[PDB]
Motif scaffolding. Structure first.
Motif, PDB file in Angstrom:
ATOM      1  N   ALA A 107     -55.426  59.875 -44.628  1.00 59.01           N
ATOM      2  CA  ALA A 107     -55.211  60.223 -43.020  1.00 59.01           C
ATOM      3  C   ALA A 107     -55.734  59.041 -42.200  1.00 59.01           C
ATOM      4  O   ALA A 107     -54.988  58.849 -41.259  1.00 59.01           O
ATOM      5  N   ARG A 108     -56.494  58.298 -42.702  1.00 56.73           N
ATOM      6  CA  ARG A 108     -56.867  56.978 -41.729  1.00 56.73           C
ATOM      7  C   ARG A 108     -56.036  55.631 -42.209  1.00 56.73           C
ATOM      8  O   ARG A 108     -55.883  55.084 -41.302  1.00 56.73           O
ATOM      9  N   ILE A 109     -55.393  55.832 -43.369  1.00 57.33           N
ATOM     10  CA  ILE A 109     -54.601  54.720 -43.603  1.00 57.33           C
ATOM     11  C   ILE A 109     -53.210  54.920 -42.774  1.00 57.33           C
ATOM     12  O   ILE A 109     -52.615  53.979 -42.001  1.00 57.33           O
ATOM     13  N   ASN A 110     -52.993  56.146 -42.475  1.00 59.66           N
ATOM     14  CA  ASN A 110     -51.867  56.590 -41.631  1.00 59.66           C
ATOM     15  C   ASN A 110     -51.964  56.319 -40.224  1.00 59.66           C
ATOM     16  O   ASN A 110     -51.137  55.616 -39.621  1.00 59.66           O
ATOM     17  N   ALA A 111     -53.247  56.670 -39.846  1.00 64.73           N
ATOM     18  CA  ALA A 111     -53.713  56.102 -38.364  1.00 64.73           C
ATOM     19  C   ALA A 111     -53.590  54.780 -38.041  1.00 64.73           C
ATOM     20  O   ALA A 111     -53.111  54.427 -36.968  1.00 64.73           O
ATOM     21  N   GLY A 112     -54.101  53.894 -38.902  1.00 63.36           N
ATOM     22  CA  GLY A 112     -53.805  52.417 -39.007  1.00 63.36           C
ATOM     23  C   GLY A 112     -52.637  51.905 -39.027  1.00 63.36           C
ATOM     24  O   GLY A 112     -52.491  50.585 -38.610  1.00 63.36           O
ATOM     25  N   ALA A 113     -51.886  52.429 -39.866  1.00 60.38           N
ATOM     26  CA  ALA A 113     -50.571  51.706 -40.152  1.00 60.38           C
ATOM     27  C   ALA A 113     -49.619  52.007 -39.101  1.00 60.38           C
ATOM     28  O   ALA A 113     -48.927  51.101 -38.583  1.00 60.38           O
ATOM     29  N   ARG A 114     -49.849  53.267 -38.425  1.00 59.36           N
ATOM     30  CA  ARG A 114     -48.955  53.464 -37.142  1.00 59.36           C
ATOM     31  C   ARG A 114     -49.311  52.685 -35.836  1.00 59.36           C
ATOM     32  O   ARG A 114     -48.472  52.515 -34.990  1.00 59.36           O
ATOM     33  N   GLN A 115     -50.487  52.199 -35.951  1.00 58.93           N
ATOM     34  CA  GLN A 115     -50.874  51.143 -34.982  1.00 58.93           C
ATOM     35  C   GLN A 115     -50.125  49.844 -35.222  1.00 58.93           C
ATOM     36  O   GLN A 115     -49.908  49.072 -34.198  1.00 58.93           O
ATOM     37  N   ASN A 116     -49.902  49.530 -36.289  1.00 59.14           N
ATOM     38  CA  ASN A 116     -49.232  48.211 -36.499  1.00 59.14           C
ATOM     39  C   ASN A 116     -47.658  48.531 -36.607  1.00 59.14           C
ATOM     40  O   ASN A 116     -46.876  47.443 -36.813  1.00 59.14           O
ATOM     41  N   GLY A 117     -47.080  49.411 -36.534  1.00 61.28           N
ATOM     42  CA  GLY A 117     -45.792  50.025 -36.336  1.00 61.28           C
ATOM     43  C   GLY A 117     -45.152  50.530 -37.641  1.00 61.28           C
ATOM     44  O   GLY A 117     -43.952  50.369 -37.766  1.00 61.28           O
ATOM     45  N   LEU A 118     -45.875  51.054 -38.552  1.00 59.46           N
ATOM     46  CA  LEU A 118     -45.200  51.593 -39.867  1.00 59.46           C
ATOM     47  C   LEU A 118     -45.848  52.936 -40.086  1.00 59.46           C
ATOM     48  O   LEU A 118     -47.041  53.078 -39.852  1.00 59.46           O
ATOM     49  N   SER A 119     -45.396  53.589 -41.021  1.00 59.60           N
ATOM     50  CA  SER A 119     -45.822  54.811 -41.464  1.00 59.60           C
ATOM     51  C   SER A 119     -46.632  54.721 -42.943  1.00 59.60           C
ATOM     52  O   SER A 119     -46.273  53.926 -43.401  1.00 59.60           O
ATOM     53  N   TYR A 120     -47.269  55.703 -43.339  1.00 62.09           N
ATOM     54  CA  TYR A 120     -48.057  55.701 -44.141  1.00 62.09           C
ATOM     55  C   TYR A 120     -46.979  55.546 -45.595  1.00 62.09           C
ATOM     56  O   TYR A 120     -47.463  55.033 -46.390  1.00 62.09           O
TER      57      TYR A 120
END
Ligand SMILES: [Mg+2]
Ligand SMILES: [Mg+2]
Ligand SMILES: [Mg+2]
Ligand SMILES: [Mg+2]
Ligand SMILES: [Mg+2]
Ligand SMILES: [Mg+2]
Ligand SMILES: [Mg+2]
Ligand SMILES: [Mg+2]
Ligand SMILES: [Mg+2]
Ligand SMILES: [Mg+2]
Ligand SMILES: [Mg+2]
Ligand SMILES: [Mg+2]
Ligand SMILES: [Mg+2]
Ligand SMILES: [Mg+2]
Ligand SMILES: [Mg+2]
Ligand SMILES: [Mg+2]
Ligand SMILES: [Mg+2]
Ligand SMILES: [Mg+2]
Ligand SMILES: [Mg+2]
Ligand SMILES: [Mg+2]
Ligand SMILES: [Mg+2]
Ligand SMILES: [Mg+2]
Ligand SMILES: [Mg+2]
Ligand SMILES: [Mg+2]
Ligand SMILES: [Mg+2]
Ligand SMILES: [Mg+2]
Ligand SMILES: [Mg+2]
Ligand SMILES: [Mg+2]
Ligand SMILES: [Mg+2]
Ligand SMILES: [Mg+2]
Ligand SMILES: [Mg+2]
Ligand SMILES: [Mg+2]
Ligand SMILES: [Mg+2]
Ligand SMILES: [Mg+2]
Ligand SMILES: [Mg+2]
Ligand SMILES: [Mg+2]
Ligand SMILES: [Mg+2]
Ligand SMILES: [Mg+2]
Ligand SMILES: [Mg+2]
Ligand SMILES: [Mg+2]
Ligand SMILES: [Mg+2]
Ligand SMILES: [Mg+2]
Ligand SMILES: [Mg+2]
Ligand SMILES: [Mg+2]
Ligand SMILES: [Mg+2]
Ligand SMILES: [Mg+2]
Ligand SMILES: [Mg+2]
Ligand SMILES: [Mg+2]
Ligand SMILES: [Mg+2]
Ligand SMILES: [Mg+2]
Ligand SMILES: [Mg+2]
Ligand SMILES: [Mg+2]
Ligand SMILES: [Mg+2]
Ligand SMILES: [Mg+2]
Ligand SMILES: [Mg+2]
Ligand SMILES: [Mg+2]
Ligand SMILES: [Mg+2]
Ligand SMILES: [Mg+2]
Ligand SMILES: [Mg+2]
Ligand SMILES: [Mg+2]
Ligand SMILES: [Mg+2]
Ligand SMILES: [Mg+2]
Ligand SMILES: [Mg+2]
Ligand SMILES: [Mg+2]
Ligand SMILES: [Mg+2]
Ligand SMILES: [Mg+2]
Ligand SMILES: [Mg+2]
Ligand SMILES: [Mg+2]
Ligand SMILES: [Mg+2]
Ligand SMILES: [Mg+2]
Ligand SMILES: [Mg+2]
Ligand SMILES: [Mg+2]
Ligand SMILES: [Mg+2]
Ligand SMILES: [Mg+2]
Ligand SMILES: [Mg+2]
Ligand SMILES: [Mg+2]
Ligand SMILES: [Mg+2]
Ligand SMILES: [Mg+2]
Ligand SMILES: [Mg+2]
Ligand SMILES: [Mg+2]
Ligand SMILES: [Mg+2]
Ligand SMILES: [Mg+2]
Ligand SMILES: [Mg+2]
Ligand SMILES: [Mg+2]
Ligand SMILES: [Mg+2]
Ligand SMILES: [Mg+2]
Ligand SMILES: [Mg+2]
Ligand SMILES: [Mg+2]
Ligand SMILES: [Mg+2]
Ligand SMILES: [Mg+2]
Ligand SMILES: [Mg+2]
Ligand SMILES: [Mg+2]
Ligand SMILES: [Mg+2]
Ligand SMILES: [Mg+2]
Ligand SMILES: [Mg+2]
Ligand SMILES: [Mg+2]
Ligand SMILES: [Mg+2]
Ligand SMILES: [Mg+2]
Ligand SMILES: [Mg+2]
Ligand SMILES: [Mg+2]
Ligand SMILES: [Mg+2]
Ligand SMILES: [Mg+2]
Ligand SMILES: [Mg+2]
Ligand SMILES: [Mg+2]
Ligand SMILES: [Mg+2]
Ligand SMILES: [Mg+2]
Ligand SMILES: [Mg+2]
Ligand SMILES: [Mg+2]
Ligand SMILES: [Mg+2]
Ligand SMILES: [Mg+2]
Ligand SMILES: [Mg+2]
Ligand SMILES: [Mg+2]
Ligand SMILES: [Mg+2]
Ligand SMILES: [Mg+2]
Ligand SMILES: [Mg+2]
Ligand SMILES: [Mg+2]
Ligand SMILES: [Mg+2]
Ligand SMILES: [Mg+2]
Ligand SMILES: [Mg+2]
Ligand SMILES: [Mg+2]
Ligand SMILES: [Mg+2]
Ligand SMILES: [Mg+2]
Ligand SMILES: [Mg+2]
Ligand SMILES: [Mg+2]
Ligand SMILES: [Mg+2]
Ligand SMILES: [Mg+2]
Ligand SMILES: [Mg+2]
Ligand SMILES: [Mg+2]
Ligand SMILES: [Mg+2]
Ligand SMILES: [Mg+2]
Ligand SMILES: [Mg+2]
Ligand SMILES: [Mg+2]
Ligand SMILES: [Mg+2]
Ligand SMILES: [Mg+2]
Ligand SMILES: [Mg+2]
Ligand SMILES: [Mg+2]
Ligand SMILES: [Mg+2]
Ligand SMILES: [Mg+2]
Ligand SMILES: [Mg+2]
Ligand SMILES: [Mg+2]
Ligand SMILES: [Mg+2]
Ligand SMILES: [Mg+2]
Ligand SMILES: [Mg+2]
Ligand SMILES: [Mg+2]
Ligand SMILES: [Mg+2]
Ligand SMILES: [Mg+2]
Ligand SMILES: [Mg+2]
Ligand SMILES: [Mg+2]
Ligand SMILES: [Mg+2]
Ligand SMILES: [Mg+2]
Ligand SMILES: [Mg+2]
Ligand SMILES: [Mg+2]
Ligand SMILES: [Mg+2]
Ligand SMILES: [Mg+2]
Ligand SMILES: [Mg+2]
Ligand SMILES: [Mg+2]
Ligand SMILES: [Mg+2]
Ligand SMILES: [Mg+2]
Ligand SMILES: [Mg+2]
Ligand SMILES: [Mg+2]
Ligand SMILES: [Mg+2]
Ligand SMILES: [Mg+2]
Ligand SMILES: [Mg+2]
Ligand SMILES: [Mg+2]
Ligand SMILES: [Mg+2]
Ligand SMILES: [Mg+2]
Ligand SMILES: [Mg+2]
Ligand SMILES: [Mg+2]
Ligand SMILES: [Mg+2]
Ligand SMILES: [Mg+2]
Ligand SMILES: [Mg+2]
Ligand SMILES: [Mg+2]
Ligand SMILES: [Mg+2]
Ligand SMILES: [Mg+2]
Ligand SMILES: [Mg+2]
Ligand SMILES: [Mg+2]
Ligand SMILES: [Mg+2]
Lengths: 117, 150
Positions: free
Chosen positions: A62-75
């Motif tokens: 869940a946290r990697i998803n939140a931090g990847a979408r801040q850089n423009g990518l999905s989990y």
RNA sequence: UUGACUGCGAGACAGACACGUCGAGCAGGUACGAAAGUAGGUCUUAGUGAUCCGGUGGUUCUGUAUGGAAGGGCCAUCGCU
RNA sequence: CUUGUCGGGUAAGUUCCGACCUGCACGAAUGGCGUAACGAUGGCGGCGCUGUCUCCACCCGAGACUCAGUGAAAUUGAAAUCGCUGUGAAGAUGCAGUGUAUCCGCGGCUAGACGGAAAGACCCCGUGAACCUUUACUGUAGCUUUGCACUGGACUUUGA
RNA sequence: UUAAAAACACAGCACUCUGCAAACACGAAAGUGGACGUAUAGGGUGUGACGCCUGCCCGGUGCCGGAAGGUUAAUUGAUGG
RNA sequence: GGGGCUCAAACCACACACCGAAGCUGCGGGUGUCACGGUGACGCGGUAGAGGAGCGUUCUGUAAGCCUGUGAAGGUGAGUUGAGAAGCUUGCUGGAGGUAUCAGAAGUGCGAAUGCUGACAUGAGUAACGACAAUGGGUGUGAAAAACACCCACGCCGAAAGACCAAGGGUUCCUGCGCAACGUUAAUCGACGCAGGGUUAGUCGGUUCCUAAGGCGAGGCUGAAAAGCGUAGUCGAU
RNA sequence: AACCCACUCCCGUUGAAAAGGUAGGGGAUGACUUGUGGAUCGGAGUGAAAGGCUAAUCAAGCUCGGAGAUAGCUGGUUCUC
RNA sequence: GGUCAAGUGAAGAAGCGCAUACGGUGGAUGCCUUGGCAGUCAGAGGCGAUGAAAGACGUGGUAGCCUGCGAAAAGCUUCGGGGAGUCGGCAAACAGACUUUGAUCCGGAGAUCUCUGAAUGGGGGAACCCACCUAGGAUAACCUAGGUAUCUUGUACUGAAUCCAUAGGUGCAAGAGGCGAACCAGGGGAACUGAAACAUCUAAGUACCCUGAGGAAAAGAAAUCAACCGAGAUUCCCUUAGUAGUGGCGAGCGAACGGGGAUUAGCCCUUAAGCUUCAUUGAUUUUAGCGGAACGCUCUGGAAAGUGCGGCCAUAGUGGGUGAUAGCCCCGUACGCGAAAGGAUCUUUGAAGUGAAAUCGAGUAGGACGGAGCACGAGAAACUUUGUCUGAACAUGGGGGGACCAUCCUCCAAGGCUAAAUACUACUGACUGACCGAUAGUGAACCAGUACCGUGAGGGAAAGGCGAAAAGAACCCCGGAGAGGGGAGUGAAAUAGAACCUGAAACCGUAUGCGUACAAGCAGUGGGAGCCUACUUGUUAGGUGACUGCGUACCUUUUGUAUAAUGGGUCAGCGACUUAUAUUCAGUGGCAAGCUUAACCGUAUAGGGUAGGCGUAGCGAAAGCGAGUCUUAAUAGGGCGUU
């Protein structure tokens, strides 16, 4: 040879009632209720050692998803791009960099994104 | 157990567990479920199977250096002091004395002596020959052991 | 004309047991056929009832001191909607 | 069958009274049909009387309620003991989804906790039990028949 | 101690048994009651004041009477084996 | 399942990615079987049930030993060690006994049996405080009076709720001293506790005299035995 | 009326009471009620008969023995790997 | 710095939860024991009309109850012991006394011995009422001491119908009567249960009721078994053998012959062994007692028996208790002694009785009918016994040898008496225990067959612990001249204070820390902030657990239970696969073609005792034959067996 049960029986009830410390009402101070409570507590503990491994992976993802979408990518695309390039870092370490080492997490997402996946 | 003839209460209707006698093993003053009676804890040991253990015991005393052999062993007049002195020359305190015949003088002495026993060749059992720290036999008693034990 | 025979019986089928089914071949005596041969009932599959007890016909068995007998054993066979 | 059919009684009568005879399945000392008096006997109808009722109202005492004193009971696996719709050992406070809801008493009412009480009495089972019946089986007390014994004489009839 | 009644008793009626050491009942028996009574008495059974009455069936089962003839126990022991 | 969903967050095709179990892999441990001489490979869910190996309790030998008033068993905490039954070391309490090791014998291990005995909870400071004849003042005593004593005044019974015999009970009768328990409340009061005292017959009632029903019954008759019936007799009041 | 009984309603049902109470109810000179003493009892007694009563117990009392009757039936069965 | 607006939201608990520390209730646990249980070795096996067992009432300086006594009443008289304290216990105090001129105390003998009870002079509701006769003594309204039940046997007197004498009646002598746990011999005699129902059968001649006797009883000296060889009374044990038989031939019941043992014994009717009672010869025990060896110092301690060092006694060293653990402190122990007088046993040698039935066995042996007993239930059913009915012979005779006959063998019924080996323990003593230790062990450790329950027969409890020593708390304060406390004192220790050792759990409180009043459910588990405490000052320990994922108790019974199916209010203590004898399999040992003993001897776990059991050979229903055998006419085949 008549054998009396007084010493051994008392020493066996006190072992159970020591494990029932902190329970509510009769669950901590009468043996019949406390014995059932101690068995159920051990049953939950065996089951919840399996569930601790499940609950933490669901939190890293869940946290990697939140931090990847801040850089423009999905989990699901980030994991596909990490396998594609070479990277084999844990999800536990990846979720640690997302919260603490935010600049290092960006370089990983950018490296995975250069693999076009 | 005395008493306990009739039913305490009737079979049905009272709301209590079924009872048939007040002297039941479940009750306080009741009887014992498997009460003991006097009996004999006597086993059978074969004649030859008892003599093989004597041979095995006697062979171990020689190997362990507990067996002491002397040419006759006697005392004059029954005196515990007289017997104590004679055992000190042989350097024995906890000893079993075996002879072909237990003399009255030798039996009267050593009766009150603490760690000393006087026995006979056919009176020496398996337990005593393992119990005492030394066994002191006479030459006549040795030539009798070989007769009985072959 | 009497094989709807006597003593068996290698080997199988079935089958919890007790029961049941088929049977080449050997020995004794037979019957039909010139003979090779066929015949241990009926085209086959239902037509049946254990043990105990009691009766009848045999028997180089036994038979309570001995010789016998009574009784018992063995083989055959009768009495049960 | 049946609240049979007819008549009376009521505004209206499956009950009542009088008849009919088609008596499922009356009947003559397990008596038949009547009967004055009697009955804390069963059914039906009237007069009087009324809080029985329309439909309850007010009043008086004893409880209930509060204060002081004394002080039980059945019950009880443990409880941080809501509603609804589903599910499910097939009728859920406790499961699922969902909706409601600050914490704790007191006076009342009984819809639920398949509420408490009595190892269901109805039903079936046990190669269970009691008591009762009889032309079930096997016995038996009592009653009765004959032989022998206690038990004899004589005469006569009569068979071998 | 959930049924007071139409249930039981009853006076009256009938059948049947009993001749006295009665029938009958309690008693291994002695004995006792019936009864210090004697068929107008005693026992059992059914019906149930009173009035009018109480019909037909003796094949079944019981009871009573008969005794000719058939069967029929212990007992006896001819005859045969 | 709900929120909510319409070029879907529906349906029909195709594609790639990811999530997802105690499944598989990685790392570290423990065990069973087999093979080889500690390594290999291949297993380790489980009721009825079969097989194997152990812990702990009381007693006997080892033990006329060893430990112990510089503190035994027991009780109560803490720490620590094993895969488990469990072991070990210690603080406090206690105040006199315990049993290493290896063997031998069992009254050898409880949560249930509407189990047995004792103690204590919940209901709950809740129901109830026993005829709805009825009580109000004053004084006294007392640590303390609605209830005790006395006085004034109300009520109730009166063919009894008043007196007296018999049965039954047995000191409950009176006095002095008391209030812990008993008294459905308090109590100075009591049929309660302690200690004293109290019942006087020629005529009352018994006994003594007599018998009823009935009992027993010498001898007697009968009966396996015990015994049954009964004569003379002698008990038996109402 | 007393006395003996127990027809109705209600209350009470953890009762004042293991069968009562308040109101009404029946008999009340008789087949009446009652005191004291006595006789009959466990396959037995007694019963104006309800299978009723025989010490709060009756389609066979209580008590102690055979006796730990029998229970193809319920319930329970105690440390570890 | 103000005013306004928006956002955010600490503290404040009526009461609850958890943890900890102190209490209270309660009585477990540990340790202990004056009480029980089971054996072994002895004793002695009865008490009673000379009044029993069992009781009532009385008896003391002072109330009650136990224990002794009995109007002479916690005692009187004598002997014997000893050797200084004593007037019993609960249960103490206050008093009165007793005595080295010999007391309390222990043993033998004597005296007294109320009332009830077989109860016995007659009655009675046990512990009460009423009498008569003889002898002695008082004068008034009695006293003292003896007698008076019934039955049996003997004897004396007497005398009905009835003449004789019989029944019957009185007087004396001796005996009996009742109680007791078991053992013994007889009379009567179940059922549940088993047979997976139930009648025959079983249980079982058991349970129970009744009658006699004894310390033991009973039985006992072949009209017995064997088998052509012999044995030699009865009783008891081990085998033969769970065999031969028996049995709705079911369930079951079950011998004998022959061996091995314990014990040793026979004698009479031409009158015996023996037994009993008196009188005497000796011995030995029992009822009581006496002597009985050897230790000091030191440490800790309230107190040494414990520590450390050194000794002594031993025919006496794992006894009990003394202030903690003692051979040498006390009482004891091994070993020596001891009896005025009672009891008992064995021994002489005398008497008396008895054994005793006279004379060798007649209503007997045998038989018929109906039953019992024999392991044997009618079965070929021998033998014993008898309720009914019959009925021999006389040693050239009679009984048995499992239907019956013949031949042989062996005994002599219808008359008696006999010890030991065997059975049991209500009762007394000593020793012992891989027995119990207060919910155990007897129901009963304690004033228990009590309290209590029932009309009665009968049923039937609970309840132990101060301390070494009462030294058991003088005195002051609060309080009702209370209950209960606060100090002070005793003690090593009073939180050892009498409801007194230790003192657990349920259950009930006070104090502190943290949490809890917008929150839904087996109350935990995984994650987890904040706060508090301690200290190693934060990768630590301990206490709380806001918030959040998952999550419907346990047992039993079931195809299946969160089940609204059963069971449990909780705690503590107790509570269910045992024991004996016969076996089969496995493991582990000893001997080995052999192995092993049982009863019983015994120096008593040794050694003897090899009767017996199993194995070395099988087949057949059997005679029998045998590495073979059975079937069969068969040396064929086949079944079983054999290196
Ligand atoms: Mg907690
Ligand atoms: Mg606790
Ligand atoms: Mg009984
Ligand atoms: Mg009984
Ligand atoms: Mg119930
Ligand atoms: Mg007991
Ligand atoms: Mg031997
Ligand atoms: Mg010695
Ligand atoms: Mg086949
Ligand atoms: Mg031809
Ligand atoms: Mg031919
Ligand atoms: Mg048959
Ligand atoms: Mg013959
Ligand atoms: Mg023949
Ligand atoms: Mg109709
Ligand atoms: Mg009509
Ligand atoms: Mg009409
Ligand atoms: Mg109407
Ligand atoms: Mg007629
Ligand atoms: Mg009719
Ligand atoms: Mg009519
Ligand atoms: Mg009337
Ligand atoms: Mg009328
Ligand atoms: Mg009308
Ligand atoms: Mg109040
Ligand atoms: Mg709510
Ligand atoms: Mg549904
Ligand atoms: Mg629902
Ligand atoms: Mg839940
Ligand atoms: Mg839910
Ligand atoms: Mg779920
Ligand atoms: Mg309320
Ligand atoms: Mg209500
Ligand atoms: Mg309700
Ligand atoms: Mg219900
Ligand atoms: Mg039941
Ligand atoms: Mg039921
Ligand atoms: Mg029915
Ligand atoms: Mg049947
Ligand atoms: Mg069946
Ligand atoms: Mg009436
Ligand atoms: Mg009525
Ligand atoms: Mg009637
Ligand atoms: Mg007549
Ligand atoms: Mg009639
Ligand atoms: Mg009529
Ligand atoms: Mg006719
Ligand atoms: Mg006729
Ligand atoms: Mg006729
Ligand atoms: Mg993946
Ligand atoms: Mg996983
Ligand atoms: Mg796996
Ligand atoms: Mg691994
Ligand atoms: Mg497994
Ligand atoms: Mg697996
Ligand atoms: Mg200490
Ligand atoms: Mg111990
Ligand atoms: Mg500890
Ligand atoms: Mg300790
Ligand atoms: Mg000690
Ligand atoms: Mg040991
Ligand atoms: Mg046990
Ligand atoms: Mg249990
Ligand atoms: Mg328990
Ligand atoms: Mg259990
Ligand atoms: Mg209950
Ligand atoms: Mg329980
Ligand atoms: Mg309260
Ligand atoms: Mg309430
Ligand atoms: Mg209320
Ligand atoms: Mg009230
Ligand atoms: Mg009132
Ligand atoms: Mg009231
Ligand atoms: Mg009142
Ligand atoms: Mg006043
Ligand atoms: Mg008042
Ligand atoms: Mg008035
Ligand atoms: Mg009186
Ligand atoms: Mg009274
Ligand atoms: Mg008074
Ligand atoms: Mg006064
Ligand atoms: Mg007061
Ligand atoms: Mg009071
Ligand atoms: Mg008084
Ligand atoms: Mg008379
Ligand atoms: Mg009489
Ligand atoms: Mg007489
Ligand atoms: Mg008179
Ligand atoms: Mg009078
Ligand atoms: Mg009256
Ligand atoms: Mg009214
Ligand atoms: Mg009235
Ligand atoms: Mg009236
Ligand atoms: Mg009238
Ligand atoms: Mg009268
Ligand atoms: Mg009577
Ligand atoms: Mg009866
Ligand atoms: Mg009826
Ligand atoms: Mg009674
Ligand atoms: Mg009654
Ligand atoms: Mg029996
Ligand atoms: Mg039973
Ligand atoms: Mg059940
Ligand atoms: Mg707050
Ligand atoms: Mg609180
Ligand atoms: Mg003896
Ligand atoms: Mg003797
Ligand atoms: Mg006394
Ligand atoms: Mg005198
Ligand atoms: Mg003197
Ligand atoms: Mg007398
Ligand atoms: Mg008399
Ligand atoms: Mg006399
Ligand atoms: Mg008299
Ligand atoms: Mg006598
Ligand atoms: Mg029977
Ligand atoms: Mg049966
Ligand atoms: Mg059966
Ligand atoms: Mg039956
Ligand atoms: Mg029998
Ligand atoms: Mg007999
Ligand atoms: Mg005698
Ligand atoms: Mg004799
Ligand atoms: Mg003989
Ligand atoms: Mg000869
Ligand atoms: Mg002889
Ligand atoms: Mg000395
Ligand atoms: Mg000692
Ligand atoms: Mg001490
Ligand atoms: Mg000592
Ligand atoms: Mg000293
Ligand atoms: Mg003769
Ligand atoms: Mg003669
Ligand atoms: Mg004869
Ligand atoms: Mg006969
Ligand atoms: Mg016979
Ligand atoms: Mg037969
Ligand atoms: Mg004869
Ligand atoms: Mg004869
Ligand atoms: Mg003969
Ligand atoms: Mg013969
Ligand atoms: Mg003779
Ligand atoms: Mg004794
Ligand atoms: Mg204790
Ligand atoms: Mg006890
Ligand atoms: Mg007891
Ligand atoms: Mg009484
Ligand atoms: Mg001091
Ligand atoms: Mg303390
Ligand atoms: Mg203490
Ligand atoms: Mg206490
Ligand atoms: Mg102590
Ligand atoms: Mg204490
Ligand atoms: Mg506690
Ligand atoms: Mg509180
Ligand atoms: Mg607090
Ligand atoms: Mg809200
Ligand atoms: Mg909140
Ligand atoms: Mg809630
Ligand atoms: Mg955590
Ligand atoms: Mg922490
Ligand atoms: Mg949590
Ligand atoms: Mg949670
Ligand atoms: Mg959940
Ligand atoms: Mg079910
Ligand atoms: Mg079901
Ligand atoms: Mg449940
Ligand atoms: Mg489920
Ligand atoms: Mg349930
Ligand atoms: Mg529920
Ligand atoms: Mg139910
Ligand atoms: Mg059920
Ligand atoms: Mg259960
Ligand atoms: Mg329950
Ligand atoms: Mg071997
Ligand atoms: Mg062959
Ligand atoms: Mg073969």
């Amino acid at each position: 040879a008549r054998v009396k049960r007084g010493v051994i029986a008392r020493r066996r009830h006190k072992k159970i009632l020591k494990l029932a410390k902190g329970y509510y009402g009769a669950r901590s101070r009468v043996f019949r209720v406390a014995k059932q409570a101690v068995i159920k507590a051990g049953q939950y503990a065996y089951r919840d050692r399996r569930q601790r491994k499940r609950q933490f992976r669901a939190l890293w993802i869940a946290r990697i998803n939140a931090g990847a979408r801040q850089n423009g990518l999905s989990y699901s695309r980030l994991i596909a791009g990490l396998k594609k390039a070479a990277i084999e870092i844990d999800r536990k370490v990846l979720a640690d960099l997302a919260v603490n080492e935010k600049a290092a997490f960006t370089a990983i997402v950018e490296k995975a994104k250069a693999s076009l996946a | 157990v005395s008493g306990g003839g009739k039913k305490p209460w009737r079979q049905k209707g009272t709301g209590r567990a079924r009872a048939g006698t007040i002297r039941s093993p479940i009750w306080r003053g009741g009887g014992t479920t498997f009460a003991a009676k006097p009996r004999s804890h006597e086993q059978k040991l074969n004649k030859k199977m008892y003599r093989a253990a004597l041979r095995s015991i006697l062979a171990e005393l020689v190997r362990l250096d507990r067996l002491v052999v002397v040419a006759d062993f006697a005392v004059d007049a029954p005196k515990t002091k007289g017997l104590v002195a004679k055992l000190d020359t042989l350097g024995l305190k906890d000893v079993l004395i075996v002879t072909d015949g237990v003399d009255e003088n030798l039996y009267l002495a050593a009766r009150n002596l603490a760690h000393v026993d006087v026995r006979d060749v056919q009176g020496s059992d398996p337990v005593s020959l393992i119990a005492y720290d030394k066994v002191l036999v006479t030459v006549s008693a040795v030539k009798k052991f070989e007769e009985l034990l072959g």
